[PDB]
mmCIF file of C-alpha atoms in Angstrom:
data_model
loop_
_atom_site.group_PDB
_atom_site.id
_atom_site.type_symbol
_atom_site.label_atom_id
_atom_site.label_comp_id
_atom_site.label_asym_id
_atom_site.label_seq_id
_atom_site.Cartn_x
_atom_site.Cartn_y
_atom_site.Cartn_z
ATOM 1 C CA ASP A 21 27.899 51.339 92.132
ATOM 2 C CA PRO A 22 24.483 50.313 94.233
ATOM 3 C CA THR A 23 21.332 49.222 92.801
ATOM 4 C CA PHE A 24 17.846 48.236 93.589
ATOM 5 C CA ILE A 25 14.834 46.349 92.016
ATOM 6 C CA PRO A 26 11.631 48.765 91.048
ATOM 7 C CA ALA A 27 9.224 47.877 93.181
ATOM 8 C CA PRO A 28 6.294 46.057 91.886
ATOM 9 C CA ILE A 29 3.874 47.906 90.010
ATOM 10 C CA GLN A 30 0.856 46.515 92.167
ATOM 11 C CA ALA A 31 2.609 48.394 95.141
ATOM 12 C CA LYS A 32 0.994 51.530 96.957
ATOM 13 C CA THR A 33 1.756 54.851 95.002
ATOM 14 C CA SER A 34 0.935 58.226 96.184
ATOM 15 C CA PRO A 35 -0.484 60.516 93.348
ATOM 16 C CA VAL A 36 1.722 63.010 92.057
ATOM 17 C CA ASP A 37 1.123 66.624 93.335
ATOM 18 C CA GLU A 38 1.158 68.682 90.278
ATOM 19 C CA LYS A 39 0.866 71.796 91.855
ATOM 20 C CA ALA A 40 3.685 70.841 93.958
ATOM 21 C CA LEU A 41 5.554 70.068 90.725
ATOM 22 C CA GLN A 42 4.583 73.413 89.289
ATOM 23 C CA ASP A 43 6.401 75.114 92.198
ATOM 24 C CA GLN A 44 9.493 73.111 91.853
ATOM 25 C CA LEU A 45 9.413 73.813 87.893
ATOM 26 C CA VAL A 46 8.915 77.570 88.865
ATOM 27 C CA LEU A 47 12.011 77.523 91.386
ATOM 28 C CA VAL A 48 14.249 75.938 88.959
ATOM 29 C CA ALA A 49 13.596 78.824 86.196
ATOM 30 C CA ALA A 50 13.787 81.470 88.867
ATOM 31 C CA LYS A 51 17.326 80.245 89.988
ATOM 32 C CA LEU A 52 19.211 80.296 86.498
ATOM 33 C CA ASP A 53 22.131 82.248 85.996
ATOM 34 C CA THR A 54 22.591 83.910 82.313
ATOM 35 C CA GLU A 55 24.544 80.963 81.095
ATOM 36 C CA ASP A 56 21.897 78.271 82.371
ATOM 37 C CA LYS A 57 19.263 80.218 80.703
ATOM 38 C CA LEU A 58 21.128 80.684 77.275
ATOM 39 C CA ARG A 59 21.682 76.686 77.571
ATOM 40 C CA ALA A 60 17.977 76.128 77.868
ATOM 41 C CA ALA A 61 17.223 78.081 74.896
ATOM 42 C CA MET A 62 20.361 76.395 73.328
ATOM 43 C CA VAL A 63 18.663 72.929 73.996
ATOM 44 C CA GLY A 64 15.230 74.183 73.128
ATOM 45 C CA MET A 65 16.506 75.138 69.642
ATOM 46 C CA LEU A 66 18.378 71.731 69.090
ATOM 47 C CA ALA A 67 14.886 69.967 70.577
ATOM 48 C CA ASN A 68 13.502 71.815 67.328
ATOM 49 C CA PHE A 69 15.951 70.880 64.808
ATOM 50 C CA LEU A 70 15.320 67.151 65.827
ATOM 51 C CA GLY A 71 11.923 67.712 65.312
ATOM 52 C CA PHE A 72 12.246 69.289 61.982
ATOM 53 C CA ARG A 73 14.686 66.280 60.989
ATOM 54 C CA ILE A 74 11.294 64.129 61.952
ATOM 55 C CA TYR A 75 9.299 65.989 59.715
ATOM 56 C CA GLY A 76 11.654 65.630 56.640
ATOM 57 C CA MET A 77 11.741 61.992 57.015
ATOM 58 C CA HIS A 78 8.244 61.460 56.799
ATOM 59 C CA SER A 79 5.911 62.027 54.355
ATOM 60 C CA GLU A 80 2.233 61.057 56.570
ATOM 61 C CA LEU A 81 4.141 61.389 59.944
ATOM 62 C CA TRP A 82 0.629 60.638 61.895
ATOM 63 C CA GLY A 83 0.253 56.864 61.166
ATOM 64 C CA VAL A 84 2.812 56.660 63.802
ATOM 65 C CA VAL A 85 0.711 58.428 66.599
ATOM 66 C CA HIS A 86 -2.097 56.500 68.477
ATOM 67 C CA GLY A 87 -4.986 58.798 69.108
ATOM 68 C CA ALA A 88 -4.656 62.442 68.902
ATOM 69 C CA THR A 89 -1.867 63.535 66.390
ATOM 70 C CA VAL A 90 -0.070 65.690 69.085
ATOM 71 C CA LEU A 91 4.052 65.681 68.978
ATOM 72 C CA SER A 92 6.414 67.246 71.466
ATOM 73 C CA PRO A 93 9.900 67.719 70.130
ATOM 74 C CA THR A 94 11.216 68.394 74.043
ATOM 75 C CA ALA A 95 9.895 65.081 75.113
ATOM 76 C CA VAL A 96 11.405 63.176 72.519
ATOM 77 C CA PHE A 97 14.661 65.208 72.782
ATOM 78 C CA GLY A 98 14.404 64.425 76.637
ATOM 79 C CA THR A 99 13.556 60.611 76.177
ATOM 80 C CA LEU A 100 16.785 60.227 73.719
ATOM 81 C CA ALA A 101 18.886 62.238 76.310
ATOM 82 C CA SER A 102 17.541 59.941 79.182
ATOM 83 C CA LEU A 103 18.107 56.891 77.573
ATOM 84 C CA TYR A 104 22.062 58.221 76.609
ATOM 85 C CA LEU A 105 22.381 58.283 80.622
ATOM 86 C CA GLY A 106 22.379 54.351 80.771
ATOM 87 C CA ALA A 107 24.043 53.908 77.572
ATOM 88 C CA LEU A 108 27.867 53.133 76.766
ATOM 89 C CA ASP A 109 30.208 52.535 73.836
ATOM 90 C CA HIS A 110 28.140 52.265 70.451
ATOM 91 C CA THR A 111 24.905 52.756 71.833
ATOM 92 C CA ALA A 112 25.771 55.956 73.494
ATOM 93 C CA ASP A 113 27.720 57.192 70.593
ATOM 94 C CA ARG A 114 24.745 56.873 68.134
ATOM 95 C CA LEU A 115 22.478 58.414 70.519
ATOM 96 C CA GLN A 116 24.964 61.129 70.948
ATOM 97 C CA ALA A 117 24.875 62.050 67.086
ATOM 98 C CA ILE A 118 20.991 62.093 66.783
ATOM 99 C CA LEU A 119 20.947 64.632 69.888
ATOM 100 C CA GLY A 120 23.594 66.955 67.947
ATOM 101 C CA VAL A 121 24.477 69.148 71.158
ATOM 102 C CA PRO A 122 27.337 71.098 70.337
ATOM 103 C CA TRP A 123 28.722 71.077 73.821
ATOM 104 C CA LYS A 124 32.452 70.010 74.841
ATOM 105 C CA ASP A 125 32.409 66.535 76.285
ATOM 106 C CA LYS A 126 32.164 66.066 80.397
ATOM 107 C CA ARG A 131 31.001 61.934 76.127
ATOM 108 C CA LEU A 132 27.929 64.185 76.286
ATOM 109 C CA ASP A 133 27.215 66.096 79.565
ATOM 110 C CA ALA A 134 23.713 64.285 79.668
ATOM 111 C CA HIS A 135 23.380 65.920 83.293
ATOM 112 C CA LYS A 136 23.855 69.072 81.759
ATOM 113 C CA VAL A 137 21.379 68.442 78.919
ATOM 114 C CA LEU A 138 18.715 67.023 80.922
ATOM 115 C CA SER A 139 19.077 70.015 83.573
ATOM 116 C CA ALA A 140 18.592 72.360 80.533
ATOM 117 C CA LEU A 141 15.233 70.795 79.594
ATOM 118 C CA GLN A 142 13.831 70.886 82.878
ATOM 119 C CA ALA A 143 14.544 74.992 82.514
ATOM 120 C CA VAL A 144 12.673 75.098 79.407
ATOM 121 C CA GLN A 145 9.891 73.580 81.348
ATOM 122 C CA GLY A 146 10.108 75.927 84.270
ATOM 123 C CA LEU A 147 10.314 79.092 81.800
ATOM 124 C CA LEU A 148 7.024 78.191 80.230
ATOM 125 C CA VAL A 149 5.034 77.452 83.543
ATOM 126 C CA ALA A 150 6.879 80.478 85.436
ATOM 127 C CA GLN A 151 4.671 82.980 83.001
ATOM 128 C CA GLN A 159 -2.525 79.867 83.185
ATOM 129 C CA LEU A 160 0.124 77.304 81.857
ATOM 130 C CA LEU A 161 0.515 73.917 83.268
ATOM 131 C CA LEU A 162 3.016 71.634 81.905
ATOM 132 C CA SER A 163 4.509 68.570 84.016
ATOM 133 C CA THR A 164 6.458 65.390 82.907
ATOM 134 C CA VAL A 165 6.938 62.256 84.455
ATOM 135 C CA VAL A 166 9.075 58.977 83.352
ATOM 136 C CA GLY A 167 8.149 56.031 84.205
ATOM 137 C CA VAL A 168 11.037 53.178 83.793
ATOM 138 C CA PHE A 169 8.976 50.014 83.727
ATOM 139 C CA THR A 170 11.260 46.615 84.065
ATOM 140 C CA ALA A 171 10.865 43.113 84.094
ATOM 141 C CA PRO A 172 10.669 41.609 87.913
ATOM 142 C CA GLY A 173 14.017 41.526 89.441
ATOM 143 C CA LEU A 174 15.813 43.670 86.970
ATOM 144 C CA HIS A 175 18.398 45.891 88.947
ATOM 145 C CA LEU A 176 18.472 49.276 88.138
ATOM 146 C CA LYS A 177 21.691 51.341 89.063
ATOM 147 C CA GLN A 178 21.070 54.167 91.188
ATOM 148 C CA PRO A 179 23.112 56.868 89.560
ATOM 149 C CA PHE A 180 21.053 56.489 86.406
ATOM 150 C CA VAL A 181 17.904 56.884 88.200
ATOM 151 C CA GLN A 182 19.200 59.933 90.186
ATOM 152 C CA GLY A 183 20.180 61.571 86.745
ATOM 153 C CA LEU A 184 16.686 61.409 85.539
ATOM 154 C CA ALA A 185 15.716 63.265 88.409
ATOM 155 C CA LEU A 186 17.374 66.235 86.513
ATOM 156 C CA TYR A 187 14.918 65.959 83.679
ATOM 157 C CA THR A 188 11.977 65.800 85.952
ATOM 158 C CA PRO A 189 11.597 65.611 89.648
ATOM 159 C CA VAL A 190 8.471 62.795 89.128
ATOM 160 C CA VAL A 191 10.515 59.401 88.296
ATOM 161 C CA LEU A 192 8.301 56.172 88.843
ATOM 162 C CA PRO A 193 10.443 53.029 88.136
ATOM 163 C CA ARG A 194 8.331 50.180 88.614
ATOM 164 C CA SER A 195 8.552 46.220 87.787
ATOM 165 C CA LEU A 196 6.446 44.386 85.859
ATOM 166 C CA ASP A 197 5.398 41.112 84.112
ATOM 167 C CA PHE A 198 6.258 41.637 80.373
ATOM 168 C CA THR A 199 5.276 37.520 79.399
ATOM 169 C CA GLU A 200 1.563 38.306 79.507
ATOM 170 C CA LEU A 201 1.979 41.292 77.117
ATOM 171 C CA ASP A 202 -1.472 42.738 76.665
ATOM 172 C CA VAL A 203 -1.944 42.975 80.467
ATOM 173 C CA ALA A 204 1.335 44.608 80.827
ATOM 174 C CA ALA A 205 -0.094 47.457 78.631
ATOM 175 C CA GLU A 206 -3.008 47.643 80.706
ATOM 176 C CA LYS A 207 -1.133 47.765 84.090
ATOM 177 C CA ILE A 208 1.065 50.621 82.940
ATOM 178 C CA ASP A 209 -1.857 52.746 81.795
ATOM 179 C CA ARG A 210 -4.033 51.768 85.022
ATOM 180 C CA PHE A 211 -0.608 52.373 86.843
ATOM 181 C CA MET A 212 -0.201 55.697 85.068
ATOM 182 C CA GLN A 213 -3.760 56.930 85.358
ATOM 183 C CA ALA A 214 -4.092 55.933 88.696
ATOM 184 C CA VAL A 215 -0.853 58.065 89.937
ATOM 185 C CA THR A 216 -1.570 60.979 87.678
ATOM 186 C CA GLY A 217 -5.037 61.276 87.034
ATOM 187 C CA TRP A 218 -4.709 61.589 83.059
ATOM 188 C CA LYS A 219 -5.490 59.275 80.196
ATOM 189 C CA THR A 220 -2.609 57.115 78.450
ATOM 190 C CA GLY A 221 -2.037 54.678 75.685
ATOM 191 C CA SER A 222 0.664 52.112 75.130
ATOM 192 C CA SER A 223 1.589 49.218 73.161
ATOM 193 C CA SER A 228 7.666 41.856 72.515
ATOM 194 C CA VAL A 229 7.405 39.147 74.962
ATOM 195 C CA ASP A 230 11.679 39.361 75.498
ATOM 196 C CA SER A 231 11.230 42.587 76.685
ATOM 197 C CA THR A 232 12.532 43.953 80.349
ATOM 198 C CA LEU A 233 12.559 47.622 79.721
ATOM 199 C CA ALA A 234 10.012 50.221 78.517
ATOM 200 C CA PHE A 235 11.031 53.405 79.175
ATOM 201 C CA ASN A 236 7.784 55.812 78.506
ATOM 202 C CA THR A 237 7.729 59.377 78.961
ATOM 203 C CA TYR A 238 4.256 61.045 80.332
ATOM 204 C CA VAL A 239 3.669 64.964 79.927
ATOM 205 C CA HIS A 240 0.475 66.542 80.814
ATOM 206 C CA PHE A 241 0.105 70.257 78.931
ATOM 207 C CA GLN A 242 -3.104 72.761 80.215
ATOM 208 C CA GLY A 243 -3.113 76.272 78.555
ATOM 209 C CA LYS A 244 -5.711 78.542 79.785
ATOM 210 C CA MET A 245 -6.130 81.370 77.211
ATOM 211 C CA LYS A 246 -7.176 84.559 78.874
ATOM 212 C CA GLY A 247 -9.658 86.745 76.982
ATOM 213 C CA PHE A 248 -11.262 83.564 75.773
ATOM 214 C CA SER A 249 -14.476 81.693 76.810
ATOM 215 C CA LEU A 250 -16.071 78.238 76.228
ATOM 216 C CA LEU A 251 -19.375 79.252 74.337
ATOM 217 C CA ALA A 252 -22.254 77.858 75.397
ATOM 218 C CA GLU A 253 -23.652 76.292 71.954
ATOM 219 C CA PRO A 254 -21.548 74.343 69.750
ATOM 220 C CA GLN A 255 -20.549 74.523 66.385
ATOM 221 C CA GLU A 256 -20.442 72.165 63.434
ATOM 222 C CA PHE A 257 -16.498 71.117 62.717
ATOM 223 C CA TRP A 258 -16.095 69.534 59.091
ATOM 224 C CA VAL A 259 -13.968 66.679 59.281
ATOM 225 C CA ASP A 260 -14.836 65.994 55.603
ATOM 226 C CA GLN A 261 -16.568 68.271 52.995
ATOM 227 C CA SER A 262 -19.101 65.407 53.581
ATOM 228 C CA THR A 263 -18.909 64.808 57.275
ATOM 229 C CA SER A 264 -19.467 66.825 60.213
ATOM 230 C CA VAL A 265 -19.275 66.938 64.050
ATOM 231 C CA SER A 266 -20.477 69.585 66.281
ATOM 232 C CA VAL A 267 -17.899 70.684 68.774
ATOM 233 C CA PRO A 268 -17.580 73.070 72.054
ATOM 234 C CA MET A 269 -15.840 75.977 70.822
ATOM 235 C CA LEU A 270 -13.333 78.717 72.131
ATOM 236 C CA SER A 271 -13.993 82.409 71.258
ATOM 237 C CA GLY A 272 -11.654 85.328 71.930
ATOM 238 C CA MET A 273 -11.192 88.647 70.759
ATOM 239 C CA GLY A 274 -8.119 90.883 70.773
ATOM 240 C CA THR A 275 -5.025 92.063 68.801
ATOM 241 C CA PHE A 276 -3.592 88.710 67.485
ATOM 242 C CA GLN A 277 -0.960 88.530 65.030
ATOM 243 C CA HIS A 278 -1.652 87.243 61.522
ATOM 244 C CA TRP A 279 -0.178 86.492 58.067
ATOM 245 C CA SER A 280 -2.134 85.724 54.881
ATOM 246 C CA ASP A 281 0.093 83.368 52.941
ATOM 247 C CA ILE A 282 -1.128 83.969 49.322
ATOM 248 C CA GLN A 283 1.589 81.817 47.389
ATOM 249 C CA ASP A 284 0.787 78.781 49.349
ATOM 250 C CA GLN A 285 -2.672 79.925 50.190
ATOM 251 C CA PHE A 286 -2.694 79.280 54.097
ATOM 252 C CA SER A 287 -3.089 81.621 56.955
ATOM 253 C CA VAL A 288 -1.703 81.803 60.434
ATOM 254 C CA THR A 289 -2.926 83.033 63.866
ATOM 255 C CA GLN A 290 -0.582 83.629 66.667
ATOM 256 C CA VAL A 291 -2.685 84.284 70.006
ATOM 257 C CA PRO A 292 -0.276 84.421 73.112
ATOM 258 C CA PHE A 293 -0.458 82.669 76.289
ATOM 259 C CA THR A 294 2.134 84.999 77.932
ATOM 260 C CA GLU A 295 4.576 87.536 76.918
ATOM 261 C CA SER A 296 6.751 85.004 75.405
ATOM 262 C CA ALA A 297 4.882 81.684 74.975
ATOM 263 C CA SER A 298 2.415 81.607 72.348
ATOM 264 C CA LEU A 299 0.126 79.094 70.329
ATOM 265 C CA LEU A 300 0.381 78.888 66.614
ATOM 266 C CA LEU A 301 -2.500 77.982 64.448
ATOM 267 C CA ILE A 302 -1.941 77.281 60.585
ATOM 268 C CA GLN A 303 -5.323 77.069 58.833
ATOM 269 C CA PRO A 304 -4.940 75.748 54.831
ATOM 270 C CA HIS A 305 -6.989 77.731 52.634
ATOM 271 C CA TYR A 306 -8.366 74.451 51.217
ATOM 272 C CA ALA A 307 -8.778 71.092 53.159
ATOM 273 C CA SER A 308 -6.783 69.215 50.882
ATOM 274 C CA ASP A 309 -3.601 71.234 51.436
ATOM 275 C CA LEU A 310 -3.677 70.209 55.115
ATOM 276 C CA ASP A 311 -0.526 67.539 54.232
ATOM 277 C CA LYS A 312 1.187 70.134 52.052
ATOM 278 C CA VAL A 313 0.765 72.837 54.168
ATOM 279 C CA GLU A 314 2.140 71.125 57.097
ATOM 280 C CA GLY A 315 5.323 70.430 55.154
ATOM 281 C CA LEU A 316 5.995 73.740 54.319
ATOM 282 C CA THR A 317 5.058 75.094 58.096
ATOM 283 C CA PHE A 318 7.075 72.593 60.092
ATOM 284 C CA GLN A 319 10.662 72.882 58.738
ATOM 285 C CA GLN A 320 13.638 74.791 59.821
ATOM 286 C CA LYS A 328 6.230 87.639 59.183
ATOM 287 C CA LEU A 329 3.097 87.943 61.221
ATOM 288 C CA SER A 330 1.929 91.429 61.800
ATOM 289 C CA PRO A 331 -0.723 92.521 64.698
ATOM 290 C CA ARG A 332 -4.218 92.655 63.592
ATOM 291 C CA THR A 333 -8.077 92.423 65.395
ATOM 292 C CA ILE A 334 -9.016 89.322 65.316
ATOM 293 C CA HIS A 335 -11.913 87.379 66.716
ATOM 294 C CA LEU A 336 -11.173 83.765 66.846
ATOM 295 C CA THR A 337 -13.260 80.915 67.149
ATOM 296 C CA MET A 338 -11.578 77.557 67.628
ATOM 297 C CA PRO A 339 -12.531 74.080 69.294
ATOM 298 C CA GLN A 340 -11.645 73.413 72.741
ATOM 299 C CA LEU A 341 -8.891 70.680 72.597
ATOM 300 C CA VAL A 342 -8.855 68.055 75.166
ATOM 301 C CA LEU A 343 -6.442 65.468 73.104
ATOM 302 C CA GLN A 344 -4.661 62.434 74.102
ATOM 303 C CA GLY A 345 -2.037 60.480 71.970
ATOM 304 C CA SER A 346 1.126 58.431 72.192
ATOM 305 C CA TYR A 347 3.834 57.168 70.002
ATOM 306 C CA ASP A 348 7.056 55.500 69.995
ATOM 307 C CA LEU A 349 10.286 57.086 69.219
ATOM 308 C CA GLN A 350 11.201 53.895 67.604
ATOM 309 C CA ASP A 351 8.706 54.849 64.955
ATOM 310 C CA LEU A 352 9.284 58.642 64.841
ATOM 311 C CA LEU A 353 13.179 58.248 64.696
ATOM 312 C CA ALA A 354 13.143 54.885 62.197
ATOM 313 C CA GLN A 355 14.925 56.686 59.243
ATOM 314 C CA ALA A 356 17.696 57.563 62.166
ATOM 315 C CA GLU A 357 17.777 53.919 62.718
ATOM 316 C CA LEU A 358 16.692 54.099 66.238
ATOM 317 C CA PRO A 359 15.637 50.716 66.193
ATOM 318 C CA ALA A 360 18.901 49.464 65.272
ATOM 319 C CA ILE A 361 20.274 51.443 68.157
ATOM 320 C CA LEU A 362 18.184 49.835 70.523
ATOM 321 C CA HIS A 363 17.877 46.160 69.323
ATOM 322 C CA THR A 364 21.795 45.861 67.836
ATOM 323 C CA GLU A 365 24.943 45.786 69.662
ATOM 324 C CA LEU A 366 22.929 47.398 72.758
ATOM 325 C CA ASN A 367 24.975 48.523 75.716
ATOM 326 C CA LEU A 368 22.538 50.152 78.501
ATOM 327 C CA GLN A 369 24.668 48.982 81.032
ATOM 328 C CA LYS A 370 24.700 52.478 83.172
ATOM 329 C CA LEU A 371 20.904 51.504 83.375
ATOM 330 C CA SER A 372 21.375 47.813 84.314
ATOM 331 C CA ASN A 373 23.681 44.926 84.556
ATOM 332 C CA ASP A 374 21.114 42.699 83.677
ATOM 333 C CA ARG A 375 19.931 41.559 80.188
ATOM 334 C CA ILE A 376 18.151 44.712 78.843
ATOM 335 C CA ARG A 377 15.337 44.342 75.725
ATOM 336 C CA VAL A 378 13.752 47.481 74.749
ATOM 337 C CA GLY A 379 9.575 46.584 74.408
ATOM 338 C CA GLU A 380 8.819 50.273 73.689
ATOM 339 C CA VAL A 381 10.432 53.960 74.135
ATOM 340 C CA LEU A 382 6.742 55.988 74.690
ATOM 341 C CA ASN A 383 5.860 59.337 74.659
ATOM 342 C CA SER A 384 2.111 59.862 76.104
ATOM 343 C CA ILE A 385 0.533 63.330 75.737
ATOM 344 C CA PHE A 386 -2.440 64.848 77.356
ATOM 345 C CA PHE A 387 -2.788 68.188 75.525
ATOM 346 C CA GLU A 388 -5.349 70.383 77.168
ATOM 347 C CA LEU A 389 -6.587 73.766 75.302
ATOM 348 C CA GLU A 390 -9.342 75.623 77.594
ATOM 349 C CA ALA A 391 -11.080 78.832 78.321
ATOM 350 C CA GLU A 407 -12.146 96.227 61.481
ATOM 351 C CA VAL A 408 -12.157 92.819 62.744
ATOM 352 C CA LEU A 409 -11.432 89.464 61.222
ATOM 353 C CA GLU A 410 -13.147 86.377 61.887
ATOM 354 C CA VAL A 411 -10.955 83.591 62.328
ATOM 355 C CA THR A 412 -13.099 80.101 62.407
ATOM 356 C CA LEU A 413 -11.414 76.837 62.714
ATOM 357 C CA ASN A 414 -14.099 74.822 61.647
ATOM 358 C CA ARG A 415 -11.997 72.672 59.410
ATOM 359 C CA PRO A 416 -8.714 70.303 60.148
ATOM 360 C CA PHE A 417 -5.639 72.641 60.740
ATOM 361 C CA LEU A 418 -2.507 72.587 62.621
ATOM 362 C CA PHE A 419 -0.909 74.599 65.685
ATOM 363 C CA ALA A 420 2.362 74.659 67.712
ATOM 364 C CA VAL A 421 2.944 76.139 71.123
ATOM 365 C CA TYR A 422 5.911 77.948 70.697
ATOM 366 C CA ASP A 423 7.977 80.150 73.908
ATOM 367 C CA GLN A 424 10.422 82.573 73.041
ATOM 368 C CA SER A 425 12.050 82.279 76.297
ATOM 369 C CA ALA A 426 13.678 78.907 75.370
ATOM 370 C CA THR A 427 13.276 79.384 71.827
ATOM 371 C CA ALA A 428 11.433 75.616 72.033
ATOM 372 C CA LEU A 429 8.493 74.165 70.282
ATOM 373 C CA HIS A 430 6.688 72.500 73.262
ATOM 374 C CA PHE A 431 4.067 71.077 70.763
ATOM 375 C CA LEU A 432 3.292 70.393 67.312
ATOM 376 C CA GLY A 433 0.081 68.999 66.234
ATOM 377 C CA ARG A 434 -2.510 68.303 63.920
ATOM 378 C CA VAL A 435 -6.328 68.197 64.534
ATOM 379 C CA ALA A 436 -8.436 66.497 62.149
ATOM 380 C CA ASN A 437 -11.340 65.886 64.546
ATOM 381 C CA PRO A 438 -11.677 67.466 68.032
ATOM 382 C CA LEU A 439 -13.278 64.573 69.335
ATOM 383 C CA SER A 440 -11.632 61.111 69.558
#
């Protein structure tokens, strides 16, 4: 098997063309057979199962996230399926158990899974909606990457950027990865031992234009607490949006569509203190139409988390720091520094007045692939 040393992160890199990536993602969904389409929905449903498994083993899950408290079940499921591509023996087996894909072995068919995740990506944007995923494989200087592994990540996303980097100076390493990712994407990012020789980071950007809405001129006060308050630019739209008021669990849900299959969900607790408990009831394994005038904050959010913290209860840190065998990734010594997910989430522009001027929960769902693309919590629209 041939190899190659990732170019040093300081080398010239042309920026990624998102509009060219979107055309590719739509092409992927366009040429999907019936079996591949069901496989995409299947993997979207399986990523949800993993996501719900992550909310059950976390009382306060959001101390894991740096910045905006947004979470991508599809990206977490893809980062694990991507690492499995380079795993062997015990490491591969333990990763396979976490994914729980009920398909016949080709070991798990990592190529079919990753190609299914890119399918749920293309299904969403093929309907205004912008979803982009790029993977950065950051390695110590001189570490040899195996070609079949890099080429298989391209099944997850056409944009794969392997670069070599000096991890000895660590605080500078985190700046170079951010200064590199922002220079090549134009987004905002965040990141965080000295033995490390590999950092496998997924960076995804979502931009959702809701039609029928508009950015109001004057801001409105957003109450982070009953004591503290901040003014925020607000979106405003009116239409027949699905809704439901849960009197038993005292919370209300609003579903405003993006497309025929993709929608945004908004869980508003009746009282502010119920936020963490209302979250437990919703994010875990009934709406009807109503004329609603929705007013919610314009969301320009950025956050990041290490899967080793999300899946600490699944012993992922042990999977990646004990008996490690990523020898399909590289023959050289691998010490995982971070397994990152960095999310740039943008939400931009008789009667029931629904106003999100208090902490709320949200989610982006797509019925095409029955996939929770994003779960999140907005205690403060500004960060």
